[PDB]
């Protein structure tokens, strides 16, 4: 075999008479998920991987874009400068896992080292036909509903010395977050998220330590997003079809060292007018549906950026990042590489 690109197919457990949009997309765009995924360990082999140059990420991005373009219809959309309007019915929206599969002549190699960081040689390599199932959650700041690192927390970046490069933190224990827009519900676009204060504190404490390992002789602190678009400044994500923007000030606030309530509460807004992630442009949806709009998720990853700077000052500070959704897919695709047999 030999590294290569080719045309992947997808697989899912989509139901075909369900109206939920990911389900409808997958049922026409993907194959049914094989009940019996063949995985074969390759004894006596080592392979180099580079999650940062994985064309599988490209194709997943392409799918998720098509899915969104076909499923979530804004009432108004701005693209070339060219505004257009169309029907914008409310929709049913809840991501399902999607598998990425290789066709005949090709195979997917999967690194199983628990220490693997995304680049360099891998020592326990197996071959599969498909990736594990991957929910295409679109978000900034917090990676929702991914898989967990198995060993210890992992730090990923294309280049840690480069402060422009987004750092992907792969958790190995999740921290639940529940976000909800209450029915009644005075401000219809008002919402909040709850996170277990102890569980978050524990999470940041451990991330700091990992981060300390790559930045020796540094105090490691966390600070609020440093600005830019609202989709990036807040933790944003779509929940049941509505675009939530949740302020993470109360999540990235100071230093976190090994030793209100039990719950951190974060304010959220639901917006109708949004910057699009698929491409440079703006979309405008209808006001939120009725009732309790709640999504309960597993924080399983983090997207961070390091301030850096030629300061003699020697405390590294880390802020929530995100916005390039290729990093979202990289956090799950990092251990796969397509190979021509």
């Amino acid at each position: 075999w030999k590294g290569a690109t080719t045309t992947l197919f997808c697989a899912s457990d989509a139901k075909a008479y369900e109206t939920e949009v990911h389900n409808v997309w997958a049922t026409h765009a993907c194959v049914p998920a094989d009940p019996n995924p063949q995985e074969m360990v390759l004894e006596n082999v080592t392979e180099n991987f580079n999650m940062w140059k994985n064309d599988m990420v490209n194709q997943m991005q392409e799918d998720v874009i098509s899915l969104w373009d076909q499923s979530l219809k804004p009432c108004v959309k701005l693209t070339g400068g060219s505004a257009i309007t169309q029907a914008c019915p409310k929709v049913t929206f809840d991501p399902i896992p999607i598998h990425y599969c290789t066709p005949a002549g090709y195979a997917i190699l999967k690194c199983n080292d628990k220490i693997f960081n995304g680049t360099g040689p891998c020592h326990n390599v197996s071959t599969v036909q498909c990736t594990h199932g991957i929910k295409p959650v679109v978000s900034t700041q917090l990676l929702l509903n991914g898989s967990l690192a198995e060993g210890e927390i992992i730090i990923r970046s294309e280049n840690l010395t480069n402060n422009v490069k987004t750092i992907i933190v792969h958790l190995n224990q999740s921290v639940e977050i529940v976000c909800t827009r209450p029915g009644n519900g005075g401000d219809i676009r008002q919402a909040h998220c709850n996170i277990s204060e102890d569980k978050w504190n524990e999470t940041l404490q451990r991330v700091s330590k990992k981060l300390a390992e790559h930045f020796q002789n540094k105090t490691i602190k966390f600070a609020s997003s440093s600005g830019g678009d609202l989709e990036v400044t807040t933790h944003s994500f779509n929940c049941r079809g509505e675009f939530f923007y949740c302020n993470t000030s109360g999540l990235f606030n100071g230093a976190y060292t090994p030793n209100s309530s039990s719950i951190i509460t974060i304010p959220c807004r639901i917006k109708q007018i949004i910057n699009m992630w698929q491409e440079v442009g703006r979309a405008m949806y209808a006001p939120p549906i009725k009732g309790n709009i709640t999504c309960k998720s597993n924080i399983t990853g983090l997207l961070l950026v390091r301030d850096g700077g030629t300061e003699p000052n020697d405390t590294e500070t880390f802020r929530p990042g995100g916005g390039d959704m290729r990093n979202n897919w990289r956090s799950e695709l990092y251990k796969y590489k397509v190979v021509e047999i």
Binding site: T140, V164, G227, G228, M276, V280, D307, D324
Partner: protein, 177 residues
């Protein structure tokens, strides 16, 4: 190299181009390696720099590989060397901001002394000259003034600030009447 001059309160647009391509990642840094402004896919991010709430970029141009750094309401202290990092490239532009102020009141008269101040950055040693309404100019360092004012010393004083040749102009109205 390339130097851009700007007046206080004005808005400036530093340019940056990627090797005739598409929409890709870019970042703008100052000389202190502090992050100013860059993209995350389709969105704009901004770093922990002093210029935060006044930096902007022209997103619509990103398809064409143009990634300007726009700085609104220029402050003297914005003066710095800025670097736009695109794909392998590093482009540099030096920003110099000046202001020219009349540190007297608004309404003067008689034999008062008018005294104009150049607000400048510490990379600057620009030459300064101010043209009276009567066409009388007065070359000067960082604070040039007039001995004794006069009645026709009122109106639109025109001041030129020279640096890297290269210039900016400050029209200042003074009223003594």
């Amino acid at each position: 190299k390339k130097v851009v001059l700007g007046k206080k309160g004005d808005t400036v647009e530093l340019t940056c181009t990627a090797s005739q391509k598409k929409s890709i990642q870019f970042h703008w840094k100052n000389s202190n390696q502090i992050k100013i402004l860059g993209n995350q896919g389709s969105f704009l991010t901004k770093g922990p720099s002093k210029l935060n709430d006044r930096a902007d970029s022209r997103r619509s141009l990103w398809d064409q590989g143009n990634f300007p750094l726009i700085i609104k309401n220029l402050k003297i202290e914005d003066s710095d060397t800025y670097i736009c990092e695109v794909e392998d490239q590093k482009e540099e532009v030096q920003l110099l901001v000046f202001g020219l102020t009349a540190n007297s009141d608004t309404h003067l008269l008689q034999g008062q002394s008018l005294t104009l101040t150049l607000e400048s950055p510490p990379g600057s040693s620009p030459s300064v000259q101010c043209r009276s309404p009567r066409g009388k100019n007065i070359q000067g360092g960082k604070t040039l003034s007039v001995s004794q004012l006069e009645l026709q010393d009122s109106g639109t004083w025109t001041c030129t600030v020279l640096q890297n040749q290269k210039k900016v102009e400050f029209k200042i109205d003074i009223v003594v009447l």
